[PDB]
C-alpha cells in the first residue's frame, strides 16, 4: 500500500534532529536539523526551525518514493532530561501538514534502570 518510512525525531533543548530512515533504520534517507535552517545558536531547537527541517525532509521523502512514516520521538534520555524539547511538537505537526502519511507514534527516550552520576555535581548548577 503506502511506502512506510521511519521518521526518528530528536527533540533536545538545544537542537532538533529530523531523521527519516527505512524500517530497519540502517539506511538513511533524509536528516535535516534545526541548525541547518537558522544562523543563530539560540533558536536551533525553536519550533520555527523545527517545521523548516520537517518540511525539507518531507519533500526529500516524496522525491525518493516515501509516502508514509512511523514516528520515533525521543528526548536526550540517558541521565539527562526525559521530556521532549519544544522542536518535537511543531516538526511532527509540520510533518502531518506536509502531505506525508503518519503511522505509529511511540516515545523511545532512553531510560536508565537505576544510572551513572549525572553531571552538575551534588549542589547542581547554580545560576
Amino acid at each position: 500500500s503506502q511506502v512506510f518510512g521511519v521518521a526518528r525525531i530528536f527533540a533536545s533543548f538545544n537542537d532538533t534532529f529530523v531523521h527519516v530512515t527505512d524500517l530497519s533504520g540502517k539506511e538513511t534517507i533524509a536528516r535535516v536539523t534545526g541548525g541547518m535552517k537558522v544562523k543563530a545558536d539560540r533558536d536551533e531547537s525553536s519550533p520555527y526551525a523545527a517545521m523548516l527541517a520537517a518540511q525539507d525532509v518531507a519533500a526529500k521523502c516524496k522525491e525518493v518514493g516515501i509516502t508514509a512514516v512511523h514516528i520515533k520521538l525521543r528526548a536526550t534520555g540517558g541521565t539527562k532530561t526525559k521530556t521532549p524539547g519544544p522542536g518535537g511538537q511543531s516538526a511532527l505537526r509540520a510533518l502531518a501538514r506536509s502531505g506525508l502519511r503518519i503511522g505509529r507514534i511511540e516515545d523511545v527516550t532512553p531510560v536508565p534502570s537505576x544510572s551513572t552520576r549525572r553531571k552538575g555535581g551534588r549542589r547542581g548548577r547554580r545560576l
Partner: protein, 214 residues
Amino acid sequence: VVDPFTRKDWFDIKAPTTFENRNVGKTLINRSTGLKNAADGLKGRVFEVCLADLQGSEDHSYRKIKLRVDEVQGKNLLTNFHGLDFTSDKLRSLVRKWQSLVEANVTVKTSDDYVLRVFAIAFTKRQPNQIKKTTYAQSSKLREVRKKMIEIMQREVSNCTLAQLTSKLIPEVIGREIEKSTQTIFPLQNVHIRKVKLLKQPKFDLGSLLALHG
C-alpha cells in the same frame, strides 16, 4: 555530485507464516556490484514492527516484534523472529502507585536450540469490594509468584520449538496460564510477557526457514 539515491535498489520484507500480515514493507540498499554483493550486505538486518501490523487486529498494538532477515530470494527477504518488546507508553501505563510490581526473568533454550530470555511482569489486582488505599502483596508472596512464573516460562519454552513459541506468544498463551497458577497466592492483573530476547542461535537451517515461509 553523485546523487547517492540513484544506486539504491528496493527489496521486499516477508514475515513467516506464523504471522498473518506477511507483507511487512520495503527496504533499500546499494545495487550489487562485483566487489560487494547486495545480498550479503542486506541480510542480518533487524526490523522493529508492531504486532498489530503483523496481525491486523489493533488489540496487539502495544507489542512490537523485531524481525531478522537471514535469507534473500531475489527482490524478497525471508525473515525470522528476532525478539519481542512492549511499547514504552504501555509499560509506563502499567506501573501505577499503591500496587505491587512483580517481575521475573529466566534464560532458557528451546527444542531447536534457540536460547531466550523471557521477561514476565505482573501486578496485584484490586478487589471490587476493597476499601483500603493501597494493594500491596507481602514480600514472601511476591517471591512465590516470582517462583511460579519462572518454573512456567521454563516449562512453556523448553518444551516447544521457536516457531511453535511464536504461536503461543501472540495470543498470550503463557500469560494466561501464569495468572491461573498465581491465583491461589494473590489475585493478579495485567500478567504479560513484556520482553523476549534472542541470545544464541543454532547452526543455520535455511531449509527450515523456507518451511516457515510457504
